[PDB]
Amino acid sequence: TPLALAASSGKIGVLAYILQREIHEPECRHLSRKFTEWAYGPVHSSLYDLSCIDTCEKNSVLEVIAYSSSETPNRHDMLLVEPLNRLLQDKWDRFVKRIFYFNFFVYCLYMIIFTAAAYYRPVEGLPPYKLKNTVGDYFRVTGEILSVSGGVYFFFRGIQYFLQRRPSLKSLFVDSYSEILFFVQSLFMLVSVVLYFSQRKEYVASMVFSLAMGWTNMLYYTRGFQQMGIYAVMIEKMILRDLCRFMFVYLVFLFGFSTAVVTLIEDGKYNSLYSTCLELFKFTIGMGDLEFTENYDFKAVFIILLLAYVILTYILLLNMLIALMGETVNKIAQESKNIWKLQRAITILDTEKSFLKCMRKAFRSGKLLQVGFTPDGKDDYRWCFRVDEVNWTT
Amino acid sequence: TPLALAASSGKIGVLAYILQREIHEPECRHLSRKFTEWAYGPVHSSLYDLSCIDTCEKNSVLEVIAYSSSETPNRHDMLLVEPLNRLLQDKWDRFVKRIFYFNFFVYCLYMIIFTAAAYYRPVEGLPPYKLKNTVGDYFRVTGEILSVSGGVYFFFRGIQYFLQRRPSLKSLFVDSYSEILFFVQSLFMLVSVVLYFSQRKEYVASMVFSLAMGWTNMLYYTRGFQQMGIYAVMIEKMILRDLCRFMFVYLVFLFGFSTAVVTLIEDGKYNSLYSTCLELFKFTIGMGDLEFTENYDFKAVFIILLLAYVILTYILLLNMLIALMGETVNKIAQESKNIWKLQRAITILDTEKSFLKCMRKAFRSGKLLQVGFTPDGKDDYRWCFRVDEVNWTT
Amino acid sequence: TPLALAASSGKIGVLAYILQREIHEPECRHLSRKFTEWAYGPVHSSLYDLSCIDTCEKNSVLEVIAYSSSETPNRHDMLLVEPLNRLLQDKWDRFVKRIFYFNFFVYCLYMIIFTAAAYYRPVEGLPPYKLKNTVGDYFRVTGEILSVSGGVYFFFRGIQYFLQRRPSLKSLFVDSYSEILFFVQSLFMLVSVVLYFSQRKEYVASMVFSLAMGWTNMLYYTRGFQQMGIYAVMIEKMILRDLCRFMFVYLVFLFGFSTAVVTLIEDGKYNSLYSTCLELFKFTIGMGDLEFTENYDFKAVFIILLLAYVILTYILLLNMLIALMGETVNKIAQESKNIWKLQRAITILDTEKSFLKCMRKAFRSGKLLQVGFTPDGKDDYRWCFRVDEVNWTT
Amino acid sequence: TPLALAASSGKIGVLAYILQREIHEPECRHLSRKFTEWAYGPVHSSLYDLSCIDTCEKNSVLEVIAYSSSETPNRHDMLLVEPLNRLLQDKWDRFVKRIFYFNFFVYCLYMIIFTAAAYYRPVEGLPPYKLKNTVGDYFRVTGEILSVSGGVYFFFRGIQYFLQRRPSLKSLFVDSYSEILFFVQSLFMLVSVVLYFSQRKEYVASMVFSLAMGWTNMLYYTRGFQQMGIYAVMIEKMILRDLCRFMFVYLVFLFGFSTAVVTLIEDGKYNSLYSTCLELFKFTIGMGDLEFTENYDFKAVFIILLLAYVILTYILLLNMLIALMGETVNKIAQESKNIWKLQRAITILDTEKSFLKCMRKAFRSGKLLQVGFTPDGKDDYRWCFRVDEVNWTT
Ligand SMILES: CCCCCCCCCC(=O)O[C@@H](COC(=O)CCCC)COP(=O)(O)O[C@@H]1[C@H](O)[C@@H](O)[C@H](O)[C@H](O)[C@@H]1O
Ligand SMILES: CCCCCCCCCC(=O)O[C@@H](COC(=O)CCCC)COP(=O)(O)O[C@@H]1[C@H](O)[C@@H](O)[C@H](O)[C@H](O)[C@@H]1O
Ligand SMILES: CCCCCCCCCC(=O)O[C@@H](COC(=O)CCCC)COP(=O)(O)O[C@@H]1[C@H](O)[C@@H](O)[C@H](O)[C@H](O)[C@@H]1O
Ligand SMILES: CCCCCCCCCC(=O)O[C@@H](COC(=O)CCCC)COP(=O)(O)O[C@@H]1[C@H](O)[C@@H](O)[C@H](O)[C@H](O)[C@@H]1O
Ligand SMILES: CCCCCC(=O)OC[C@@H](COP(=O)(O)OCCN)OC(=O)CCCCC
Ligand SMILES: CCCCCC(=O)OC[C@@H](COP(=O)(O)OCCN)OC(=O)CCCCC
Ligand SMILES: CCCCCC(=O)OC[C@@H](COP(=O)(O)OCCN)OC(=O)CCCCC
Ligand SMILES: CCCCCC(=O)OC[C@@H](COP(=O)(O)OCCN)OC(=O)CCCCC
Ligand SMILES: CCCCCC(=O)OC[C@@H](COP(=O)(O)OCCN)OC(=O)CCCCC
Ligand SMILES: CCCCCC(=O)OC[C@@H](COP(=O)(O)OCCN)OC(=O)CCCCC
Ligand SMILES: CCCCCC(=O)OC[C@@H](COP(=O)(O)OCCN)OC(=O)CCCCC
Ligand SMILES: CCCCCC(=O)OC[C@@H](COP(=O)(O)OCCN)OC(=O)CCCCC
Ligand SMILES: CCCCCC(=O)OC[C@@H](COP(=O)(O)OCCN)OC(=O)CCCCC
Ligand SMILES: CCCCCC(=O)OC[C@@H](COP(=O)(O)OCCN)OC(=O)CCCCC
Ligand SMILES: CCCCCC(=O)OC[C@@H](COP(=O)(O)OCCN)OC(=O)CCCCC
């Protein structure tokens, strides 16, 4: 359709024009989109025809925008057009706000069960473990089998993401950061089951990375909270635009001077590359030891290197990272809000493919008062609408 | 009254119109508010009729604005209208500035007595304590009974706040942060008396929280000092808008990775959840120890977790908090000043209900030259006024 | 004079008008200030009459501006008027730049002598000390008597500051920070001589404060270096506007919670108020120890207090100070430059009262081509001038 | 030539005029520069005559701009003129992008060889070392002789820089920071060979400074990556504008108070100036020890000095450096991008003097359709061109 072709390429001017057309003419109500029904005292109502916007067949304007390949003109600004913004607010507060908070309540009760099933793991060797008849057993083994089943659930839910949208290796690593992190979490959990029944103690490695990931994935549910959701979008921007640029340059100075400190150190505990790469990393934390070794030669060389480390990477690069984060906050004060609107918009559309059996409640704002004097005949119950309101001063 | 109805809903345009009306017409001085008496060389005087603004009966415009429910249109901007701003400056420098500094001088001499009565507390067991005939006794027991009486005073003064304004469970936790903190301070002090005479050593817990709170409550008196008062408003904004958003996300990463570090640690001192949640909190301070334990397995797993902690929460989240505080300073450079004007305005109105017996000094700028040719008759001593001045250029 | 009355009150509009007047009329060259001599191709010269501006008798416009009481309208902006700004640049690069750098070269060679005379102080008891016949003696005792003489010099130079300008107890602590710090430095040095010959070892206390002050006073000479001088003005603004507002609130939380930690601590090493006020100050540095004591009761109370300290004063107030310094840089990006221009302007005028015996070199830009057809007669060598240049486009 | 005279002095208005002239007149195509060949639907082509811009004889406009003495009007803005900007983009993506990445791939494989040849250096005394017949030998000695040859290569490539451009002692230390750091790296490597065969163990000093420098020189290749290259320009600006101004003032307070701490310390381990200048430097890192010594007198003096250190240089100067970096990011948000465009432009022109034997591929955009009706005759294959494109709306 030519409407969805404007949405797919991101033509924001045309998409504003089609969703907001209105003209006073005979045989124009067959063509017009925005209808103005009630003209009372200066607050005037408005009805948007909403034909293929929300509930179209296999190509809907909400589904075209929210599933974009992130290479469009402006995928984040199209949801600010007057029919689309209030409808997603209407589908939120009426329908999906209750079913989103229940999903966050399940996942918060998922990680409590999975923590307490891992916190009280058995300590003796040779997995697996014959559960005793005690009250502590039959009560965390039920905690384990629920926690494994959650890793199975996010695995099959992670596959059917890829089986539907198919981001195809570029929109994967660019526009779908959230669904990978649910999948990699479930991937460590299933590897930790395979290593558990193969009688190896290294399952607790993959369990921990399945547990460290799982709490950091709880920032996914900060969307649906406006002040928190815009905050978690900014955390995404600091990783992709500052630690992409800091941790390259920092690890050059880190691995650079640590290889310069080893070759000066003659022998001892810190003779390896690993044991002194920590000792130069401790300056970044705030636990840097200047005299961390004595067994070398040329003390004047050894402390010029540390001072050239501390001047270059501690009182410059960490104090420069704070300044560059200070500029990307003022730059992404508006763009990070619009990216939050798109993150809510995906979660709204995801539940309509989930709670699809009761498809009547997904429809918005009634289907009535359609065709006032249609030229093809009397079809005044054809298309839906959505009521808004306006302001004063004529 | 229709004037206070504009103040209660926060109609700033109407409230500017009523307090500043003036027109040259016969039988208009009965209706006009702003009077221009002395028209000398280009500095021209101005008199504001001030009828129900300051000293009305049970609904005054200062009392309506300053006791707002924080849900109005602009409660912080209405005090910038030309009669209201200079009057609160006039009631400050003439009347309430002396009686405010005495209240800060009492409370500063309250916390010195309450500190020194707690610093020299008796150390032996089984409270209470038979005071000896020494000079040190009969000199801190008098220090205690004054300090208990201060907790009684802020308790009854905290009740009669709630018995008058009745914030009703929403304006309580939103618009009245200061009066709760005086009340909770007095609440710990009275619990520390009940535990004292019930022969339990745990009174010193509630005494300390009554003493730690009491010095932090001394930031209440930073209002009445313009450069300090605007500074303490900004401390309120950083708690409610940044540590509301930092300490949620920080404690997710903190409790997330600390539960990931326990389940890797086999046994030892740091096997509990509490003993290692401190050890990951020490990275935020600047005392983080990378090799804080050795009794585990898979050292490569244990230090990926700490590095994934330090990268995520130390060189990102603390360096992001500084950037987000850097944006909310430039955003609240003006709003935090106007909130300080409202905090002074409450303290001005609070003393008129306190020093009410000498109610003549509360009246401002005389009650004279009222009705120049009133149409109802000769009533030229009816209503008050307030003199201002103007500038040059006609 | 009415010219200096505009400079004393800071009327910048009138002062721009008097120093830049020019009109084409007969008998106007007796009244005009700005003369335009050479009108070549579009670069046009300009001559400023400069009568009472620089070299007046007992009231000169440079001396009136630069010796202001800091209560004027704009004392920092009057030096941007076109005759005054290029003249101070002319007196700098031609005359005072060489004699300023020699004063910085003496004072830099003063603190090297005074350091090395204190670094090698004798270590045995009972001052004073009979100097031996060694080569090390008769070589630092000469270093001492030069360093004492420098303290005598800054003492008498500090008195004759006050004997001339007389800031009178308000402009002292507001507009003359630099001359106090040279005086207090010399004051510790002279007290350290009185305690030296009175056979008390406490002279080394006042010597150290005379030595710690003396190197911090070397930031005085950062003026005369434009990028450094504007930087040292900003250090003055961070002390007077941020550490005036931080160190009040910080010491309230510091002394507040430290008195809350003592009264919980039963007995031991940290039972005093002083020994734990350091231990809460170490959290600000980055050396804060959470488990710094064990001899108390109610461990849950003891670590709520430390966490309520660290949350309130470390991850809030130090991270808020960086944000507030980030706003006062953008606010004082222009004002701190103009304050540097006034700090140079005082140092230019101070040497004309110092190198006064050769008063001919202090005069600027010649005294010639004065009165072209003066109406009182032929007086064409009466008043001086100063040549400038202009730009293209007619 | 008068064109290059506009480029050498940096007349950006004239240089925009000459490279973009076009007029419709007979006998104007002999004089015009910008040709508009294809006028289709509203995208219109454009051809730039490009005569002495890129491939002139001994004075080319790209070579004049990119080899400027940094004292011109705007050397960084001239590359934004419409022929020059797209041509350097054309010579990048077509020709030099492949040969730049190979140079970064060689140098990255140079420092890996030079690290691993230094990491496994022999530990016994008396250099040089008779290589054994083992497999580890004949495999790092080949690693050494490649790493020495790289120091020889950057030495002769560093000389022929100076033998061609001749920056002449002012553009050396101002406009050529990169080529010095490649040269000083090679200078330490060759000194480390001379000390190696002169049987002295101090070669490992100069090897380390040749290895610490060499990894920091890998930030040279961040140009050619747009988000990284603009980032490394900003690192240059923080060194030259903030650590030029911080490390002067910081070392005054550091050396100031450390000389004040020595003269108070009577005797012991920290009696020297060096041993306590570290202990005051550790406060900047975050490892400052307040009670780092006890053997002195007047403890009240000793901790006023440390608190006057920590207040002045830790909670002021490091927190002021972050604010001043926060202002020079917003100030150099645009200038640092244009300096990156000039750093790419030098690397493009450097390879045309390197890959000069295949000089045909250096020519851009063909040499055809030159002279449409030249007045001197038929010379329609005289000068080259370069095709661009334009936008809609007539
Ligand atoms: C141990 C590693 C932990 C990493 C911590 C990060 C946790 C945050 C989890 C999270 O919410 O992911 C967020 C981003 O976090 C990251 O991807 C960080 C990358 C770390 C390698 C949200 O990304 P989404 O998957 O929701 O995708 C969004 C987002 O990409 C946005 O930019 C637009 O593209 C679109 O709106 C949409 O694609
Ligand atoms: C141990 C815990 C210590 C907490 C430290 C904070 C001490 C500061 C005390 C203080 O002055 O409280 C200030 C705010 O501090 C806080 O409430 C911090 C909340 C911490 C949970 C002032 O609040 P007020 O009670 O004066 O109310 C004001 C204020 O709310 C303003 O926003 C507007 O609403 C109105 O002007 C008025 O309602
Ligand atoms: C151990 C204590 C060390 C304190 C460190 C600060 C050293 C800096 C020395 C210094 O240069 O003083 C500068 C200011 O430093 C301070 O006063 C800091 C106050 C610390 C209590 C310059 O002040 P001036 O004496 O030159 O006066 C100037 C200045 O006041 C300006 O604001 C205007 O008023 C006028 O131009 C003129 O009056
Ligand atoms: C152990 C010491 C390590 C120092 C670390 C810094 C490494 C960075 C290496 C580097 O890329 O050098 C960059 C600058 O780094 C420094 O010079 C830092 C100075 C440290 C004393 C790039 O400089 P260029 O040589 O490419 O020259 C450029 C640059 O000057 C620019 O400003 C303009 O002048 C011109 O575009 C051109 O001249
Ligand atoms: C969901 C599975 C939980 C099973 C936990 C379990 O078997 O341990 C039994 C007790 C642990 O108490 P103890 O500390 O005395 O046991 C020693 C630890 N292995 O459990 C507890 O006392 C606290 C339980 C907390 C659950 C939220
Ligand atoms: C500039 C030197 C200051 C005096 C210190 C000195 O010369 O000695 C060289 C060494 C060791 O210093 P020490 O005072 O401890 O001397 C003990 C002799 N091994 O210390 C150094 O080498 C310090 C190098 C600092 C470079 C920034
Ligand atoms: C307001 C009640 C104060 C009562 C304090 C008291 O009884 O102690 C008597 C002395 C304490 O001196 P000591 O340190 O020798 O006493 C041992 C401490 N228990 O008191 C002092 O020496 C200092 C008193 C300071 C008051 C501001
Ligand atoms: C989200 C809950 C996850 C389960 C946490 C858990 O098993 O910890 C239980 C106790 C610690 O008890 P112990 O350390 O004495 O048990 C010894 C275990 N080897 O510590 C606690 O109860 C911590 C509760 C803190 C909740 C915020
Ligand atoms: C990338 C490896 C660098 C060389 C170090 C190495 O392989 O050993 C693995 C362990 C221990 O390192 P060590 O050098 O101390 O080896 C001692 C053997 N236990 O150290 C680690 O596991 C480090 C993990 C770092 C991940 C960022
Ligand atoms: C200006 C007065 C200087 C007098 C210094 C003095 O008497 O000491 C003599 C020697 C000190 O050498 P030593 O370290 O061996 O002396 C032991 C220290 N008391 O001096 C030196 O070796 C270094 C002198 C440095 C001067 C800049
Ligand atoms: C606001 C004053 C509150 C009372 C403070 C107090 O009792 O401390 C008194 C002394 C400490 O004396 P001691 O530690 O020797 O007394 C031992 C007590 N067990 O230390 C001091 O006097 C500190 C005074 C600092 C004021 C800023
Ligand atoms: C929330 C409790 C988490 C589990 C820890 C707990 O309950 O014990 C109370 C104490 C001591 O904790 P331990 O695990 O070391 O128990 C040892 C018993 N003394 O630790 C505390 O009191 C911690 C207070 C933290 C408040 C933020
Ligand atoms: C390019 C020259 C490299 C020569 C290195 C060499 O001679 O050492 C031989 C072995 C070192 O293994 P070891 O740790 O057992 O040798 C003891 C260290 N002197 O080498 C290795 O095992 C690792 C080689 C890594 C090369 C990238
Ligand atoms: C501005 C110079 C002031 C004089 C400094 C001084 O006497 O220090 C001399 C030496 C230290 O020699 P020592 O520590 O061995 O002398 C022992 C003294 N008890 O250390 C040095 O020489 C430091 C020189 C550093 C200059 C930047
Ligand atoms: C303001 C004093 C607070 C009470 C502490 C006091 O008076 O003693 C002076 C010394 C030592 O303090 P102590 O409590 O450890 O007393 C032990 C006696 N040597 O400590 C000091 O000198 C502290 C100087 C702090 C200046 C900011």
Sequential DSSP letters for B47-91? EE--SSSSS-SS--HHHHHHT--S-SS-TTTGGGSHHHHHHHHHH
- Read off the amino acid at residue A323: A
Domain-terminating residue out of D285, D309, D331: D331
Name the E strands within chain A: 34-35, 46-48, 387-388
C-alpha span between B73 and B7 (Å, rounded): 10
Q: How far is the CA of D293 from the centre of ligand 15 (A)?
A: 16
- Read off the amino acid at residue A126: L
**Residues listed for chain B:** 394
Are residues C293 and C352 both part of a single domain?
Answer: no
With a CB cutoff of 8 Å and minimum separation 6, the contacts of B305 are A208, A212, B257, B260, B261, B264
Residues of C in contact with B285 (CB under 8 A): 283, 286, 288, 290, 310, 314
CB A20 within 8 A of CB A33: yes
Asked, for residue D231, whether it belongs to a domain, the answer is: no
Q: Is the CB of C295 under 6 A from ligand 11?
A: no
Closest-CA residue to C261 (of B120, B116, B216, B119): B119
- Write out the H or E segment, with its range, that includes residue B388: strand B387-388
Domain-terminating residue out of B222, B243, B273: B222
C-alpha span between D298 and A348 (Å, rounded): 70
Are residues B178 and B257 both part of a single domain?
Answer: no
Of A204, A235, A285, the CB nearest to B310: A285
Are residues A195 and A209 both part of a single domain?
Answer: yes
> Does the beta carbon of B282 lie under 8 angstroms from any beta carbon of chain C?
yes
Reading phi first (left if > 0) and then psi (alpha if -120 to 50, else beta), residue B365 is in left
Q: How far is the CA of B273 from the centre of ligand 12 (A)?
A: 9
Are residues C367 and C285 both part of a single domain?
Answer: no
Q: What's the structural domain count of chain C?
A: 3
Cα separations (Å) of B54 from B17, B49, B65, B77, C92? Answer: 17, 11, 11, 17, 60
**Residue B274 DSSP SS3:** helix
**Residues listed for chain D:** 394
Note the helical H segments in B163-317: 172-175, 177-197, 203-216, 226-238, 244-262, 273-285, 299-309
Closest ligand 13 atom to residue D136 Cα is: 7
Structural tokens at position D130: 């008779």
Q: How was this structure determined?
A: cryo-EM
Question: Which residue, chain included where needed, has tokens 């030891």?
Answer: A289
Structural tokens at position A394: 């004529």
CB pairs under 8 A between B and D: 3
Question: Count of H helices and E strands in chain C?
Answer: 15, 3
Binding-site positions of A for resiniferatoxin read 177-178, 216, 223
Asked, for residue A208, whether it belongs to a domain, the answer is: yes
Are residues B257 and B303 both part of a single domain?
Answer: yes
Nearest 5°: the CA angle C178, C183, C184 is: 100
Are residues D125 and D217 both part of a single domain?
Answer: yes
Q: How far is the CA of C268 from the centre of ligand 12 (A)?
A: 23
Could you tell me which chain B residue has the CA closest to the CA of A246?
B315
C-alpha span between D136 and D144 (Å, rounded): 13
Asked, for residue B249, whether it belongs to a domain, the answer is: yes
Residues of B in contact with A239 (CB under 8 A): 316
Are residues C343 and C327 both part of a single domain?
Answer: no
- Exposed, middle or buried, C82 (CB in 10 Å: 0-12/13-18/19+)? middle
Q: What are phi and psi of C44, to 5 degrees?
A: -120, 135
CB C107 within 8 A of CB C221: yes
**Residue D337 DSSP SS3:** helix
C-alpha span between A240 and A342 (Å, rounded): 18
Pocket of ligand 7 (CB under 6 A): B 116-117, 120, 136, 139-140, 143
User: D318–A322: do the CB atoms touch at under 8 Å?
Assistant: no
> Does the beta carbon of D320 lie under 8 angstroms from any beta carbon of chain B?
no
Asked, for residue C92, whether it belongs to a domain, the answer is: no
Q: Relative to the alpha carbon of C281, which ligand is closest? A: 15
Are residues A324 and A240 both part of a single domain?
Answer: yes
Are residues A154 and A202 both part of a single domain?
Answer: yes
Give the structural domain span for A275. Answer: 227-331
Residue window 213-252, chain A: list those with CB within 8 Å of chain D: 241, 244-245, 248-249, 252
C-alpha span between B100 and B106 (Å, rounded): 10
With a CB cutoff of 8 Å and minimum separation 6, the contacts of A303 are A290, D278
Closest-CA residue to B183 (of B205, B207, B151): B151
Question: Which residue, chain included where needed, has tokens 């004591």?
Answer: C293
Domain-terminating residue out of B276, B300, B331: B331
Residues of D in contact with C205 (CB under 8 A): 264, 298, 301
Are residues A15 and A52 both part of a single domain?
Answer: yes
Round the CA-based radius of gyration of chain B to a whole number and report it. 29
Q: What are phi and psi of A392, to 5 degrees?
A: -80, -165
C-alpha span between D54 and A130 (Å, rounded): 80
C-alpha span between D222 and D228 (Å, rounded): 5
Are residues A234 and A186 both part of a single domain?
Answer: no
Asked, for residue B305, whether it belongs to a domain, the answer is: yes
Report which protein residue has its CA nearest ligand 15's atom 16: C274
> Does the beta carbon of A287 lie under 8 angstroms from any beta carbon of chain D?
yes
**Residue B363 DSSP SS3:** coil
- Read off the amino acid at residue A95: F
Resolution value (Å, 1 decimal): 3.3
Are residues D326 and D294 both part of a single domain?
Answer: yes
Asked, for residue D70, whether it belongs to a domain, the answer is: no
Strand partners, D46: D388
CB B72 within 8 A of CB B9: yes
Name the E strands within A69-125: none
CB B310 within 8 A of CB C313: no
Residues of D in contact with B326 (CB under 8 A): 326
Closest-CA residue to D118 (of C286, A18, A264): A264
C-alpha span between C249 and D392 (Å, rounded): 61
Q: Relative to the alpha carbon of D243, which ligand is closest? A: 4
CB D45 within 8 A of CB D36: yes
Asked, for residue A109, whether it belongs to a domain, the answer is: no
> Does the beta carbon of C326 lie under 8 angstroms from any beta carbon of chain A?
yes
Asked, for residue D381, whether it belongs to a domain, the answer is: no
